[PDB]
Write a protein that binds this ligand. Structure first.
Ligand code: CL
Length: 157
């Protein structure tokens, strides 16, 4: 129903994940789904996703509007899943959640743990990787991750 993707910058991995899952739920015609993304630093806040990721997305029929924003405390109460790309992200989000006095009930998880191959768990930050190889690996990891995640949430178990 409500899913938040989280990357450190909210400018590469998380906006791509947001747009990808947004596409999947329409191509699967699901309801009542809400997908968003947020970040853990002010670095790229208030800007649009990094241009070479919007290109890779367009090259797959997807587009993103998204302005980089920080995760807020409210986010932890308004989402069912919050997905980290990194174990760094995960640890910061786990510390964050435990600092909120009414403990939240969002599930906070490494998105890549749905891939099913531990050697492919980690979705690396492509921001500083020269060329497109970092974005391409991340896109594929994010796509499979979202696919297996949806397969699991619809399942009767
Ligand atoms: Cl398609």
């Amino acid at each position: 129903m409500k899913v938040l993707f989280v990357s450190i910058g909210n400018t590469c991995r998380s906006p791509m994940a947001e747009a990808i899952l947004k596409h999947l739920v329409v191509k699967r015609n699901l309801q009542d789904w809400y997908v968003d993304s947020a970040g853990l630093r002010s670095w790229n806040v208030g800007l649009e996703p990094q241009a070479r990721g919007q290109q890779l997305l367009k090259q797959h029929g997807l587009k993103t509007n998204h302005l980089g924003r920080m995760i807020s405390a409210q986010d932890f109460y308004d989402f069912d899943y919050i997905f980290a790309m990194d174990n760094s992200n995960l640890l910061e989000l786990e510390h964050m959640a435990a600092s909120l006095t009414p403990s939240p009930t969002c599930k906070i998880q490494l998105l890549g743990s749905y891939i099913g191959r531990k050697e492919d768990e980690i979705i690396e930050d492509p921001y500083f990787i020269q060329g497109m190889g970092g974005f391409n690996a991340a896109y594929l990891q994010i796509l499979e991750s979202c696919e297996r995640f949806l397969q699991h949430y619809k399942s009767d178990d």
